[PDB]
Amino acid sequence: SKPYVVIDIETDGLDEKKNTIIEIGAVKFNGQQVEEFNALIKYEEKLPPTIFKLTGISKSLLDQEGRDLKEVLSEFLLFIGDLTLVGYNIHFDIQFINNKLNKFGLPLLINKTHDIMRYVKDEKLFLDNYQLQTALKSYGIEDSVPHRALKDARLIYHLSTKVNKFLARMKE
Numbered sequence: 289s290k291p292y293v294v295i296d297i298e299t300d301g302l303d304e305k306k307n308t309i310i311e312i313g314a315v316k317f318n319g320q321q322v323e324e325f326n327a328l329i330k331y332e333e334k335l336p337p338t339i340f341k342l343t344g345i346s347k348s349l350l351d352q353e354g355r356d357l358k359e360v361l362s363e364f365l366l367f368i369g370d371l372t373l374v375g376y377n378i379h380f381d382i383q384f385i386n387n388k389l390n391k392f393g394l395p396l397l398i399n400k401t402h403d404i405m406r407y408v409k410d411e412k413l414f415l416d417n418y419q420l421q422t423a424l425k426s427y428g429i430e431d432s433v434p435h436r437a438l439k440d441a442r443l444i445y446h447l448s449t450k451v452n453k454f455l456a457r458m459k460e
């Protein structure tokens with residue numbers, strides 16, 4: 289019943305400093321209903337075709353639909369406000385987002401956070417592994433993970449509504 293925002297990003301690599309954000313997505317429960325945020329990011333580098341393999345995102349898509357990262361980050365800060373942020377291995381997203389906020393002279397995140405993966409690890413002890421895809425199956429969600437920011441955030445949000453220990457902490 290408390291508001292929260294599930295966040296997810298896609299990147300061109302794993303290094304918060306040297307790699308960059310190519311898509312941001314978020315699903316906000318504002319206390320009454322759901323709202324959504326999503327932007328692809330303009331990109332001037334060489335996207336490792338392994339990124340194309342994983343996400344389906346190409347240079348052509350970023351050129352055609354991408355938006356300036358600083359502008360998008362400013363809008364993202366307005367969308368989340370000071371609400372609790374939720375994710376799946378959320379430190380990955382926070383490390384990238386804070387690195388780029390700092391780079392552009394924007395405020396950094398000070399939001400409280402909850403990580404659905406932590407709750408899954410404690411509830412589903414016998415999972416083969418703890419990739420998001422594996423966790424979803426364990427809770428009766430058979431969707432394939434597309435590795436697109438808003439689509440993944442929707443799946444994480446759906447998962448959040450099925451993890452009782454998380455819901456108990458967010459109640460009231």
Ligand SMILES: Cc1cn([C@H]2C[C@H](O)[C@@H](COP(=O)(O)O)O2)c(=O)[nH]c1=O
Nearest residue numbers: 296297298299300301302343435436440
């Ligand atoms: C799964 C995976 C992700 N990544 C990067 C690119 C993805 O956009 C970003 C976040 O992953 P994700 O699709 O699960 O949300 O991390 C890699 O560089 N190699 C990988 O094997």
Ligand SMILES: [Mg+2]
Nearest residue numbers: 296297376440
């Ligand atoms: Mg992710």
Ligand SMILES: [Mg+2]
Nearest residue numbers: 296435436440
């Ligand atoms: Mg993703």
